[PDB]
Every structure is written in C-alpha cells, then in structure tokens.
C-alpha cells in the first residue's frame, strides 16, 4: 500500500554559480539570486545544513569586490531572527571560531556544531536550506562567498513543495539532535524521524503541473531511520535502472576509502551498465591544483573499457576552470564543485563527492526524481559543459588548460 | 576439531608439456608421467575428461609427433584385460569417439555426462586417479596434441592415498551423473562428503615435510557439504597474499563468456594491489582463437600501475611460435596452463578464469600451503615463462610474435 499523495504545486528550478570569466556561447538563475529571494520571502523559519562558513572578505583575508554577494547574503541572514524568523544552523565542527556564526548568534539565531568525527569518523558535508517548511535548496554551494562568484556550482531549489520540505526537515532534525553536547546516535531513532517516502514508494507530487515521483536519500547509514533510503542505494538504483545513457559530473571520483580500502560499488555499477546493457557512460571529473593525483589511474582504468568488441562505451573528460593573473590571488577558487547524475529516465542531485567515506561515514543527502522537465534541463547543463573548451581528454597537455591540473 | 592427519609418504612432481620447437635457457613431461602411471596400475583407474583425440585418425592428420598420444591409448587398452577396473567419464560429445569405442571393447567402462542439460555447462575437468593412490590433475586433455604441440602444466601426486581417495568422491559425482536420467540430488548422499577443505585441510607429509592440502570443486550444485568451492579457494589465495600474485591462465575474462559482468576475481586482484601493495603479474595466452574482448579488460587492469597509488599490476601475453609445418596441425601451438602462485601458497586448476567455469562447468583445483618446495618450483616455471622471448607487452606489434594473436 502506497503512502498518501501530495497536492502542493511544487516547482523546481536548477540553480548554478558560474565563476567570473567563464563564458559558454549559448540560462538558469544564479545561486546568489535564488538565496536572496528565499531570504526575502522568509516569514517563519530557516534550517541550514552546512559544511563551513566564509561569507566575507575578512573570513578569507582578502579585499575582493567578488565577495559582495556573499557579504550581502550574510547581511540578510542576520536580519532574519529580529523580524521573527526562527533560524537553526547545523555546521560541521570547525577548527577555529567562526565569525559569521558569532554574528548570527548575536542576531538571535541558534547554532549547533556537529562532531561527526567522533560519532562516525566523517564530517557534516551536507549543504541544504529549508525555508518556511515550504521551499528548499539542495546542491553543491557551501556558505562561502567564493561559491557565488569564483567556483562553479549546481543545485536545485524546490518551491511550494511542503510535503517534500517537511521530509527534508526530518534529516535536518537528525543533525540537530546530534548537535547537542552529550548526544549519541541511537540504535533505533524515534519514530518522528521516519519516512514513508523512499525508493520503494516515492512521494507522488505535482511537479511543474505534471505528476512525478520524488524522494530524498541520506548518508551515512547510522543516520538513516527505518524507512529512509541510503544515498548509495539510491545512486546505484539509478545507475542500475539506466538503459540508454549515464552522464555524471562530480568534482572528485575515487573507487576507494579516500588503513586504505578498495571500494568498487559505483565503479562496478558503471562497468556492469556498460557491458551488460550497452549504456553510454560519460564521466566529467573536475581538476585543479588540489586534485588527488591517484584519481588518474582509476579514471584511465574506466576509459580502457571503450572497445568495439564488447561494444562497451565509457568516456572520461576533466573540466578545468581557467584562472587569470588577478583570479589566481583568490584562495581555494576556480574549480567546478558540481555533483550530479542524469540518465534517460532519472535525475540525481547530491551534496557528496563520489568516494566511499561520503557513503559510509560522512553526512550527505540527494534528491531523486522520475517524470515522463527537470531531467532534460540537467542533461542540457551536462552536454553544455561536456562540449565546452573547458573539458579535456585524459591525454591533454597540462599548460593548455588555463589553470593548474595535477591529473594532467 | 581437525580431521585425522595423513601418514602417506606423498610426493608431488610438477609435470609439463613443452611444444616441439620452444627453447628455454626441467620437469618430467606429461607423457612420461602418464606412461609410468599406466604401467604401474594394478587395481583401478578413474579418468575425468573433456574429449578424446589421442590418435592421428581422430584429428585427420599424419603427424609423427602424435606417436606419444597413440602409445598412451595403447597402454590404456591393456588395463582391463589385466584386471584393472577402468571408469572413464567424458563430457557428452557431439559425435562418436573412436578412442572410447576401443576402450569399451577392451573392457573399460565409459559414461558420458550431459552437463549442458544439468547445469548449462560442460565437463571440463582433467584428472586421473590411479589405484586410489596416485593422481594427475592439470591442463592436459586426452589429446595427443596435449603431449607435443601445446604447452601444458599439471601435477602428479604419488603415494598419497588419503588425498587420492578424496579426489575419488568428486569423480563419483561425475560417475553418478553419467547414468541416464540421474538428476543431481538437492543434498548429496553422505558418502560424497569430505572433511578436508579451506577451514580444515588435510595434514600431509609432502616430500618429507609437513604441508596442508585440499581439493576444491566446481560447479556449486556438484559440491557436497564439506567441499570448498573452486572460486572460494582461488579467492582465498588472492586475499591471503601479502607480497606477490603470479597467474598464468590461457583465457581470463571478467564476464560470463544473456550477458553478465563478473568481477569476483578482478576485484580480488584490484583489492590485493591497492590495499596490500601486492605485485600482481598476469600472463595470458594468445593465439588465433583468442576472444578479442579480452584485450580491453586486460588494459583496464594494467592502468592501475601508478606511482601515486603504488599499485603494481602488469600484464604480458604468451605466444607459442609456429613454423610453416606446425601451422598445419589443427588447434595447437598455445599455452593451456592454468595456475596461480603467491609467496605463501600454490593453486593448480583445470579451469580458465571466466565465470561459467565457476558457476556451471565442472572443474577441480589443488591448494597447497607449506613452510620452498612445490611453491618455489611453480614460481620458477612462472618466472621462466614471464622473462622468455615468448612473453610480450600489450603494445607489442602483431608481426613480431611468431603466430597469429588476436589481442595484438
Ligand atoms: C611410491 O612408493 C613406491 C613403493 O610402494 C615406490 O615404488 C618402488 O620403487 C622402488 C625403486 O625406488 C622399487 O624398487 C625396486 O624393486 C625391485 C624388486 O621389486 C619386487 O620386490 C619389491 C619388494 O618387495 C618387498 O616388499 C613388499 C612390500 O613390503 C613385500 O610385499 C614383499 O614380500 C617384499 O618384502 C616389491 O614391492 C615389488 O612389488 C611390485 O611389483 C610387482 C611386479 O611389478 C607387482 O606384482 C606388485 O604388485 C608390486 O607392484 C616386486 O615384487 C628391485 O629388484 C630393485 O632393485 C634394483 O634396482 C635398484 C635401483 O633401481 C638397484 O639399487 C638394485 O641394485 C637393483 O638393480 C628396486 O629395489 C620398488 O619395486 C617400487 N615398488 C613398487 C610397488 O612399484 C615409488 O618409487 C614411490 N613413488 C615415488 C614417486 O617416489
Ligand atoms: C518550473 O517552474 C519554474 C517557475 O516558473 C521555472 O523556473 C524558471 O526557469 C527559467 C529557465 O528555466 C528561468 O529563466 C526563470 O527565472 C525561472 N523562474 C523562477 C521563478 O525562478 C522552471 O523552469 C520550471 N521547470 C521546468 C522543467 O520547466
Ligand atoms: C618431491 O619428490 C619427487 C620424487 O622424487 C621429486 O620428483 C623428481 O623431481 C626431479 C626434478 O623435478 C625430476 O628430475 C625427477 O624426475 C622427479 N621424480 C619423479 C619420480 O618424477 C620432486 O621434485 C620433489 N619435490 C621437491 C619440491 O623437492
Ligand atoms: C509559489 O507560490 C507563490 C504564492 O503562493 C506564487 O506567487 C509563486 O509564483 C509560486 N512559485 C514560486 C517559484 O514561488
């Protein structure tokens, strides 16, 4: 027996940050405008799951005009509680004090810091916003001014979708519980955290005026209540159900536990899809000066499967954001942070890079949607990026790419 | 509680077939060992076999190099009239076999196992059990080519009655299924079961020093309760290795040769190399009949050799040269060897390394651990072959190899 259907008029918008200087002779609203609109409409509540906070020039020891959007975001955040909006912030436990969070505290917001390292030996990596139990953002953008103007980002805003937003709030509530000082993960979570919407029975929603199936997946497994699909299971179900193509854009990909362990769950899913079903796989991996060089061997290993006897067809490119003389002075910028997957039948938008810890120890969430739309728009972003001059084959020269790339 | 130790004076001898013309800078030949066993037989002979082409008449040839195979058939014909009870199990042929007609007329018993109806595989196993005392197990078929025109690797275990009687239970499974209408019991009668397996191996005296030995079996429906499956035994050798893994097999393929991807061994090797720094060397045979789909999978493995991960996987192809006269012999001039050696353990098998051999087709393997010996001799066979001019890297030119090779 399926759970109750939803009648809210849900509308989904893909939201991107395109770094200054990147041009794509060819648009989605930017992450900055979507966040400021959400904040301007907020009247009752805001829940933010976050990794770190650097919204200001002072935070990064810089004097960049590019930080203005981030600075504006922070100002609108400080204004929320004094106008009646209950703000709750969950952040991964930091090394030093955070100024953004101290300002938010003095404006009346609540903050708890989640020590995922003690609980599970991971971090709180999830990025999402839940606003007025009605709208949500979920995607790759951190609370970082660079994430608006100097690095590439992909996420989704779901508007007017209370059924799904309350479902996200259950995940946030797990974080909020573990943010108290003496908290320990329960053996069995209270029934209030549980959901009836999952891979087996997704939520039936109206999405842009058309029926669709949607659910939210969660990581790590100790944070998953009884009926919540694990993130790895949802991702692999998409990989395994594909019959025509699998397009993947992710910042890092590694079939390992980044004592070292080999971790082939995703890698074997792609090998299987291509050999048994002839599905076309395209893998778009980001590269900058901080890329883990051990990525190259595994990527070459996949690309060897492209072969006219098995008729398997797997292809890999690297996406590199060019940096000019002034931009190279910005710390930790000029990269592509996207983490998403689209097939001929399904969409997957996530907060986690594709290696084992994000699926066994670290916090993450993903949104899964099936419809007969958002899918075609996600495929359009992927093809634009894959065909741009910013994407390069594994044999490309490292000086011909516009930025440092260890994988070349 | 371990089973009873054995006090038989077991002695193991590596036995090889070296094709005419192949030269190396030496173990007894398959032919000599088989002739000694046949002349000494006094009470019983069991042969598990794939096919029978011991004579020139069988292959429609006039080769003098067939004489050894013909002598073998002659000496087999002398067994029954001397009182030796001969039982031959053969994979169900697609036509009459003259060898088997002549053996029936001399008094031997012959049964044909239709594994295709039983499990959708074949009866691929090659072994001899002699007087419940000695056995041959290896790659050589009942084929005169297997003595002089193809490269073979096997073992003869002499004076080891406990282990030979253990092999006879496997043969008895074939003999039962060689009757018409036999159906493979859901649980085998207790007489087929064994106490010697991966968990508690037979304790033997091997060349005067203690050793641990057991015999593994395929496919799973022919395995009674205490019999280790072939795949489990092979994978345990791969996972226990700490220094190196040397494998020489005629075919290797991570699939079910409706198409299925089959990564059990492949992921074993990837894990060994990444997690434990194990040096894996893979020596694959190549001739004009090689499945071309092998090359892409082998390239995928060789891509893991990297100075960042420190994984060290290497692949060579072994090609037996042929001169103009030899190319007239049908289905010859290849290396049929199937074995694995580590710094700790020996594995000698009858199966090629692809999925059907472990799920549907009959096979047997011998696993030995000892604290030098058989292990060091197998490693010496491998290193000789690996450093010989008959071994070539994946980028070698097809014209420089001495024979047709599909993977180059
Ligand atoms: C695995 O183990 C077996 C042992 O079981 C071993 O085979 C033996 O190998 C040795 C060589 O190293 C052979 O030794 C030769 O034997 C010649 C005489 O053979 C006759 O006498 C044998 C001894 O009989 C005594 O012991 C038995 C058992 O205890 C007992 O019943 C008797 O009453 C008696 O006390 C006898 O075993 C043997 O019987 C076999 O053969 C007959 C005929 O084929 C057959 O009917 C039987 O059923 C049985 O199979 C036979 O009766 C001897 O002349 C010869 O001496 C010459 O050679 C040596 C060296 O070459 C010179 O030094 C010497 O100067 C002479 O020129 C030699 O001693 C022995 O016969 C083998 N036994 C068998 C059964 O074959 C294998 O080597 C082991 N395998 C491995 C790989 O190591
Ligand atoms: C679902 O409806 C929303 C709301 O109208 C659409 O969002 C618009 O998308 C276009 C480009 O795709 C933007 O230029 C507009 O600014 C967006 N509007 C808002 C309010 O953000 C969305 O495109 C629709 N989804 C589909 C699949 O058509
Ligand atoms: C174990 O004992 C057997 C019995 O002698 C050894 O077999 C001999 O091995 C040498 C070298 O390979 C050959 O020249 C002989 O022909 C073999 N004898 C027989 C009867 O075939 C075997 O080598 C020993 N194993 C070890 C590790 O020492
Ligand atoms: C959501 O609902 C509001 C008011 O109910 C409506 O005005 C708006 O256009 C809808 N869509 C979005 C994206 O907010």
d(CA B81, CA B94): 29
Distances (CA, A) of B141 to B147, B339, B355: 9, 16, 21
- What is the fold, at CATH topology level, of the domain defined by B9-180+198-400? Endonuclease; Chain A (3.30.870)
Contact B265, B301 (CB under 8 A): no
DSSP B390: T
Cα of B75 to ligand 1 centre, how many Å? Answer: 21
Q: What is the DSSP string of B158-203?
A: ES-HHHHHHHHHHHHHHHHHTSTT----SS--GGG--S-SSSS-EE
Q: B207 to chain A, minimum CA–CA distance in Å?
A: 39
Backbone φ, ψ for residue A66 (5° rounding): -60, -20
Burial B102-128 (b: 16+ CB within 10 A, else e): bbeeeebebbbbebeebbebbbbbbbb
Kindly state whether B299 is in contact with chain A, defined as any CB-CB distance less than 8 angstroms: yes
d(CA B376, CA A230): 48
Per the structure block, which two tokens stand in for A108?
Answer: 């009346």
Measured between beta carbons, which residues in chain A are less than 8 angstroms from residue B271? 262
Closest-CA residue of chain B to A307 = B296
DSSP H helices, A179-313, are 231-241, 265-277, 295-303
Per the structure block, which two tokens stand in for B69?
Answer: 């195979």
Burial A362-390 (b: 16+ CB within 10 A, else e): bbbbbbbbbbeebbebbbebbeebbeeeb
Experimental method: X-ray
d(CA B339, CA A232): 37
Q: Is the dihedral of CA A226, A230, A233, A239 positive or negative?
A: positive
Kindly state whether A264 is in contact with chain B, defined as any CB-CB distance less than 8 angstroms: yes
Ligand nearest to the CA of A369: 2
A309 to B301: CB separation less than 8 angstroms, yes or no: no
Resolution of the solved structure (Å): 2.0
B304 to A294: CB separation less than 8 angstroms, yes or no: no
Give the pairing of strands A314-319 and A391-392.
Answer: antiparallel
Closest-CA residue of chain A to B263 = A268
Which among B296, B305, B306 has CB closest to A305? B296
Per the structure block, which two tokens stand in for A212?
Answer: 């669709």
Kindly state whether A309 is in contact with chain B, defined as any CB-CB distance less than 8 angstroms: yes
Kindly state whether A261 is in contact with chain B, defined as any CB-CB distance less than 8 angstroms: yes
B263 to A264: CB separation less than 8 angstroms, yes or no: yes
Cα of A395 to ligand 4 centre, how many Å? Answer: 48
Residue with tokens 């990147």: A22
B33 lines ligand 1 (CB under 6 A): no
A193 lines ligand 4 (CB under 6 A): no
d(CA B397, CA B403): 11
B308 to A302: CB separation less than 8 angstroms, yes or no: no
Q: Is the dihedral of CA A246, A248, A254, A256 positive or negative?
A: negative
Which among B259, B297, B306 has CB closest to A294? B306
Distances (CA, A) of A384 to A139, A222, A379, B63: 19, 38, 9, 65
CB atoms under 10 Å from CB of B333, counted, come to: 25
Kindly state whether A272 is in contact with chain B, defined as any CB-CB distance less than 8 angstroms: yes
Residue from A307, A268, A237, A306 nearest B268 by CA = A268
Per the structure block, which two tokens stand in for A329?
Answer: 């002075």
Cα of A213 to ligand 2 centre, how many Å? Answer: 19
B270 to A264: CB separation less than 8 angstroms, yes or no: yes
**What is the position in ligand 4's atom list of the atom closest to the CA of A135?**
14
Contact A289, A320 (CB under 8 A): no
Residue from B110, B132, B33 nearest B75 by CA = B33
B35 lines ligand 3 (CB under 6 A): no
Residue from B315, B270, B294 nearest A268 by CA = B270
**What is the position in ligand 3's atom list of the atom closest to the CA of B14?**
12
Contact A242, A343 (CB under 8 A): yes
d(CA B4, CA B292): 48
The residue nearest atom 17 of ligand 3, judged by CA position, is: B13
d(CA A305, CA B295): 9
d(CA A98, CA A142): 14
Cα of B13 to ligand 3 centre, how many Å? Answer: 5
d(CA B151, CA B337): 7
Closest-CA residue of chain B to A305 = B296
d(CA A311, CA B230): 30
Q: Is the dihedral of CA A140, A145, A151, A155 positive or negative?
A: positive
Closest-CA residue of chain A to B299 = A304
Contact B298, B285 (CB under 8 A): no
A264 to B255: CB separation less than 8 angstroms, yes or no: no
* Burial of residue B43 (number of CB atoms within 10 Å: 0-12, 13-18, 19+): exposed
> Mapping DSSP to helix (H, G, I), strand (E, B) and coil, where does residue A322 land?
coil
> Mapping DSSP to helix (H, G, I), strand (E, B) and coil, where does residue B40 land?
helix
Burial B344-367 (b: 16+ CB within 10 A, else e): ebbbbbbbbbbbbbbbbbbbbbbb
Assigned superfamily of A9-185+202-400:
Endonuclease Chain A (3.30.870.10)
Cross-strand partners of B220 = none
The residue nearest atom 5 of ligand 4, judged by CA position, is: A160
Per the structure block, which two tokens stand in for A198?
Answer: 């999952």
B28 lines ligand 3 (CB under 6 A): yes
Contact A73, A50 (CB under 8 A): no
d(CA B188, CA B182): 12
DSSP H helices, A188-294, are 231-241, 265-277
Backbone φ, ψ for residue A172 (5° rounding): -55, -35
Residue from A116, A146, A173 nearest A288 by CA = A146
Q: What is the DSSP string of B249-307?
A: ES-B-SB-----B--HHHHHHHHHHHHH--EEEEEEE--TT--TTHHHHHHHHHTT--T
Backbone φ, ψ for residue B15 (5° rounding): -130, 130
Residue from B342, B355, B339, B347 nearest B198 by CA = B347
- Name the helix (H) or strand (E) containing A252: none
Q: A51 to chain B, minimum CA–CA distance in Å?
A: 28
B308 to A294: CB separation less than 8 angstroms, yes or no: yes
Kindly state whether B259 is in contact with chain A, defined as any CB-CB distance less than 8 angstroms: yes
Contact A16, A30 (CB under 8 A): yes
Residue from B257, B263, B221 nearest B238 by CA = B263
> CA dihedral defined by A59, A62, A65, A66, rounded to 10 degrees?
-70
CA-based R_g, chain A, Å: 20
The residue nearest atom 23 of ligand 3, judged by CA position, is: B13
d(CA B392, CA B395): 8
d(CA A56, CA A65): 10
Give the pairing of strands B345-349 and B338-342.
Answer: antiparallel
> Mapping DSSP to helix (H, G, I), strand (E, B) and coil, where does residue A162 land?
helix
């Amino acid at each position: 027996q399926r759970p109750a259907p939803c009648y809210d008029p849900c509308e989904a918008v893909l939201v991107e940050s395109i770094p200054e200087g990147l041009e794509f002779p060819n648009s989605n609203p930017s992450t900055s405008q979507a966040w400021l609109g959400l904040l301007a409409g907020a009247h009752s509540s805001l829940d933010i799951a976050s990794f770190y906070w650097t919204l200001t020039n002072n935070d990064t020891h810089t004097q960049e005009p590019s930080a203005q959007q981030g600075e504006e975001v922070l100002q609108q955040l400080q204004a929320l509680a004094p106008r009646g909006v209950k703000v709750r912030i969950a952040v991964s436990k930091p090394n030093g004090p955070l100024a953004d969070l101290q300002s938010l505290l003095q404006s009346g917001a609540q903050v708890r810091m989640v020590d995922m390292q003690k609980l599970t030996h991971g971090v709180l990596h999830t990025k999402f916003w839940v606003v007025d139990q009605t709208h949500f953002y979920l995607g790759s953008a951190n609370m970082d001014w660079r994430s608006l103007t100097q690095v590439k980002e992909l996420g989704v805003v779901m508007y007017n979708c209370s059924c799904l937003a309350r479902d996200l709030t259950k995940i946030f509530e797990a974080y909020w519980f573990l943010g108290q000082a003496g908290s320990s993960i329960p053996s069995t979570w209270p029934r209030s955290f549980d959901t009836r919407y999952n891979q087996e029975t997704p939520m039936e929603i109206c999405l842009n005026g058309t029926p669709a199936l949607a659910y939210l997946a969660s990581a790590p497994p100790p944070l998953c209540p009884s009926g919540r699909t694990p993130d790895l299971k949802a991702l692999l179900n998409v990989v395994d159900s594909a019959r025509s193509f699998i397009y993947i854009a992710v910042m890092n990909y590694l079939p390992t536990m980044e004592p070292r362990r080999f971790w082939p769950a995703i890698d074997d899913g792609l090998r299987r899809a291509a050999y048994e079903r002839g599905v076309k796989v395209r893998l778009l991996i980001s590269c900058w000066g901080h890329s883990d060089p051990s990525m190259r061997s595994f990527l070459l290993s996949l690309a060897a499967l492209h072969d006219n006897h098995t008729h398997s067809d797997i292809q890999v490119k690297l996406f590199v954001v060019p940096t000019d003389e002034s931009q190279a002075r910005i710390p930790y910028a000029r990269v592509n942070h996207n983490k998403y997957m689209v097939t001929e039948r399904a969409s997957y938008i996530g907060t986690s890079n594709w290696s084992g810890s994000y699926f066994t120890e670290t916090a993450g969430t993903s949104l899964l949607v099936t419809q007969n739309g958002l899918r075609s728009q996600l495929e359009a972003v992927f093809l634009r990026d894959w065909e741009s001059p910013y994407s390069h084959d594994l044999d490309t020269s490292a000086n011909s790419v516009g930025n440092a790339c260890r994988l070349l």
